[PDB]
Design a protein around this nucleic acid. Structure first.
Ligand SMILES: [Mg+2]
Ligand SMILES: [Mg+2]
Ligand SMILES: [Mg+2]
Ligand SMILES: [Mg+2]
Lengths: 151, 202, 132, 70, 119
RNA sequence: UUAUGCUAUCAGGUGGAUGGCUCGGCUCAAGAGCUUAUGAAGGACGUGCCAAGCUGCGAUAAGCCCGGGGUAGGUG
RNA sequence: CCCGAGAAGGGAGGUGCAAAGUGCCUGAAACCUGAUAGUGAUGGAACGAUACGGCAUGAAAGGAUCUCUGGCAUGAAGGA
RNA sequence: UGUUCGGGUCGAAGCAGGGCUGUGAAGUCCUGUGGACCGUUCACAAACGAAAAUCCUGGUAAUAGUAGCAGCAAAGCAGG
């Protein structure tokens, strides 16, 4: 419902920021994608996300390893997230545009931080058998990225 | 009937929950002291009588003991006050004739008892806690007690002075002479007041 | 500041207290490290089957008067002085620098504290917590 | 009783928590149990059963005041 | 007029909060300058639109000007010169309190004003 | 660059405890104490420039007339 | 002013002593995300107490005949 | 609450983490936050101290990105 502070405060001299506010996506899948893309470059990250949305590339699922089998190539369980990939792509676009407005060079920048902070919950309901109604809720996510000109 | 205007019934056993009373059309506990909105176990009661009794002989004896304590310079001095007079202070009967606060202040300055009045004035300070919201905003100090034999304009002139309490001889009690159960209160008398106390409390 | 006047018996007692209070337990309630609802103060164990209350050597140590420090140097600062907590500038006259050191109260302001510290520096009294 | 003396005692000076239930931990209400199970206490207190003597009306009776010669 | 039997804060704040709107005219009171008080005999007066005030407390100690408006319910007056700026830049009146001002020039146009001030 | 993890601290999210404040509540005391067929209390419906709820009012409808108090703003 | 399909939202830049940014005073814990220190894919458990070591920290509020290493004098029970 | 002596925008209460004192209940001080109130001597009071009641109210985990989104009417494809 409001703004958010960042868990890391890089110097504004060589730094770009961006936040995705209250995205309606799964926090676990977004956590896995954010883990995968941290430390890479901007162009490499965008190419990898393009290949993920195209179903040509699998992200490794290490913490939330359930509901998945092992994928081709050299890895254990992994999936093909789509919605989380598109949300992260939008946030990356915004961060690169902000950095180029700062007068910096996007092509030689790194994702030095990408986290998720799940936000408020809208409380829905679903009717069960024998007269009970258990909740079903709309989880939200906050995505944060920081780009830096140092490795 | 606070916390008890309800028709709650227990669900009994077999329902998987506790045995407290609950609402008839819901599962919310009520009426019991550990349930939210329930009554209070052992609250205060308006019919409790908290008055105390003291026999007249021992009450008069305590009053005499407190009156005789103002003669001792040590009890008065260590109790808090500041004075430069020869205890006890006795004044001529025209003190009941004073009608302006300025005249009373002149007399107190000339009798070496005005620094206590100033101490009470500057010691007035804001109280701490929930007492501020209920009417007791400050904490006051006690300076000086003036005693007169009969009602006169002096009970109206030395009335606004900070800390000073002026009373007649037929209105002395133990609070006036032992504020907080500590005797040694600075006081002033007159000749008529001395006349009134031949067998006053014996 | 006035040199301390620890005469030899009191110096011996002071070193004895240093050693003994070195070898003293923490006196923490039972199972305070296995739940977070419990704070780390001391409560007497009360159940009949409890292992600490039954005085098992591995469970810890019960609170008892055997751990008391020597009566001559009880309450003294580890520097050897006795600390009195000062909350006004009308209480430095009721202090002697030979064995007492003041501790200015926490809530004193800045200029009040400056005046107190000036009068304490001149008086020879040692100040434990002074911003310097 | 001194309530503060028993903060942390649980039973509060009663023994088991199965005591202090109600009127059955006292043997009945009032002077109940006259001569079945409280007979000895009934005799020692001064509540023995029986009726003994008669009374005259208070209209006719008098209670004289006395004073000795000494 | 609420006597010494109203020494409870709850009662005083009720009286000041839910007041009849003809009593809120009295809360628009401000001190008079020396000449005004020594020629009308009232130590104070009420502030009305069209008179010159001298601010005494706050950020504008010493600035003078007319009263541009008065609101009874709010309890605040508006003065010439005393302004605040928007973020985009637009000078706006800043409300004050009539007990922080001094009256130096009364505005006599009602005719009933003189009687209203005193007696 | 040892992955999945364990312990402790820090930064952030969620959450709404603690503290400070309070036009509310409760108890005691002193007063005052009936109203309606000349249509009561209570209810339904309506009534605002933009007006859904509450409050007030009744097709003259957040209201009309007269006397006093009050004085420069008012439109719950 | 720039990004964005945008009356969403983000960045930069302002207002204010202070963001206190609209259900906006302070803002705890459970719970969740990241970072730092120790440890870690040959390993046995009421999660700790006591003694000895490794690694990390030890600004304030704690020590300066205090910490470390040795010499000398007296030395109780015991005593080669 | 009565009484004595005080502190605070040159920064009170509260909160997070630390140093010292006490056998202990606990006290006091330091650092970060906070932006307005808080103590103390001698006494007196109580709607006065929580780890547990298949305790009450609120918030929130694991289970878990799992079950379900099939059974009685298996419905969609091309071009624009
Ligand atoms: Mg979802
Ligand atoms: Mg049904
Ligand atoms: Mg209630
Ligand atoms: Mg609890």
């Amino acid at each position: 419902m409001a703004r958010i502070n960042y868990s890391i405060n890089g110097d504004p001299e060589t730094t770009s920021k961006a936040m995705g506010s209250e995205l309606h996506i799964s926090p676990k899948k977004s956590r896995e994608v954010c883990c995968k893309i941290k430390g890479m470059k901007a162009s490499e990250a965008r190419k990898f996300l393009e290949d993920v949305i195209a179903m040509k590339q699998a992200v490794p699922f290490k913490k939330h390893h359930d509901g998945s089998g092992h994928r081709k190539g050299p890895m254990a369980a992994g999936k093909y997230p789509i919605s989380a990939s598109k949300e992260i792509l939008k946030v990356l676009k915004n961060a690169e545009s902000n950095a180029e407005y700062k007068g910096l060079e996007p092509a030689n920048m790194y994702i030095i931080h990408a986290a998720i902070q799940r936000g408020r919950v809208i409380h829905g309901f679903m009717p069960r058998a024998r007269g009970r109604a258990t909740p079903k809720d709309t989880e939200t996510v906050n995505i944060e990225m920081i780009l830096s000109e140092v490795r | 009937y606070s916390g008890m205007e309800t028709s709650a019934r227990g669900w009994g056993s077999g329902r998987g929950v506790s045995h407290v009373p609950r609402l008839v059309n819901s599962s919310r506990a009520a009426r019991v002291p550990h349930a939210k909105g329930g009554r209070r176990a052992h609250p205060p009661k308006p019919e409790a009588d908290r008055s105390e009794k003291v026999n007249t002989k021992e009450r008069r004896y305590a009053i005499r003991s407190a009156i005789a304590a103002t003669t001792d310079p040590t009890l008065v001095s260590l109790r808090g006050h500041i004075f430069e007079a020869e205890l006890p202070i006795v004044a001529v009967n025209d003190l009941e004739s004073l009608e302006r606060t300025k005249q009373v202040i002149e007399f107190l300055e000339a009798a070496g008892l005005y620094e206590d009045v100033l101490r009470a004035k500057y010691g007035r300070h804001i109280r701490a806690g929930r007492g501020k919201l209920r009417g007791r905003k400050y904490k006051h100090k006690k300076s000086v007690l003036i005693v007169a034999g009969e009602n006169t304009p002096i009970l109206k002139a030395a009335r606004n002075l900070s800390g000073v309490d002026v009373v007649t001889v037929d209105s002395l009690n133990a609070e006036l002479l032992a504020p907080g159960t500590h005797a040694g209160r600075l006081t002033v008398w007159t000749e008529s007041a001395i006349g009134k106390l031949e067998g006053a409390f014996q | 500041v006035s040199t301390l006047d620890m005469d030899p018996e009191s110096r011996r007692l002071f070193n004895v207290r240093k050693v003994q209070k070195g070898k003293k337990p923490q006196f923490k309630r039972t199972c305070s490290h296995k739940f977070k609802r419990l704070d780390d103060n001391w409560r007497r164990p009360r159940g009949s089957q409890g292992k600490q209350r039954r005085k098992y050597v591995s469970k810890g140590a019960l609170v008892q008067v055997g751990y008391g420090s020597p009566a001559a140097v009880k309450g003294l600062h580890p520097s050897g002085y006795s600390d009195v907590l000062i909350s006004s500038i009308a209480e430095l006259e009721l202090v002697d620098p030979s064995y007492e050191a003041i501790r200015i109260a926490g809530t004193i302001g800045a200029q009040k504290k400056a005046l107190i510290l000036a009068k304490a520096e001149e008086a020879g009294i040692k100040v434990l917590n002074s911003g310097r | 009783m001194d309530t503060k003396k028993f903060r942390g005692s649980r039973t509060c000076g009663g023994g088991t928590h199965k005591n202090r239930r109600g009127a059955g931990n006292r043997g009945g209400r009032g002077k109940a149990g006259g001569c079945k199970h409280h007979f000895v206490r009934a005799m020692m207190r001064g509540y023995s059963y029986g009726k003994h003597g008669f009374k005259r009306p208070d209209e006719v009776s008098r209670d004289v005041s006395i004073v000795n010669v000494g | 007029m609420i006597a010494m039997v109203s020494k409870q804060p709850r009662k005083q704040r009720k009286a000041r909060y839910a007041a009849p709107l003809h009593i809120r005219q009295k809360f628009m009171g401000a001190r008079l300058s020396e000449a005004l008080t020594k020629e009308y005999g009232t130590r104070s007066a009420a502030v009305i639109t069209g008179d010159t005030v001298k601010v005494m407390r706050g950020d504008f100690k010493g600035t003078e000007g007319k009263v541009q408006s008065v609101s009874l319910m709010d309890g605040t007056i508006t003065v010439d010169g005393v302004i605040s700026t928007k973020v985009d830049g637009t000078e706006v009146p800043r409300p004050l309190n009539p007990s922080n001002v001094m009256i130096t020039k009364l505005e006599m146009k009602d005719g009933r004003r003189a009687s209203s001030i005193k007696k």
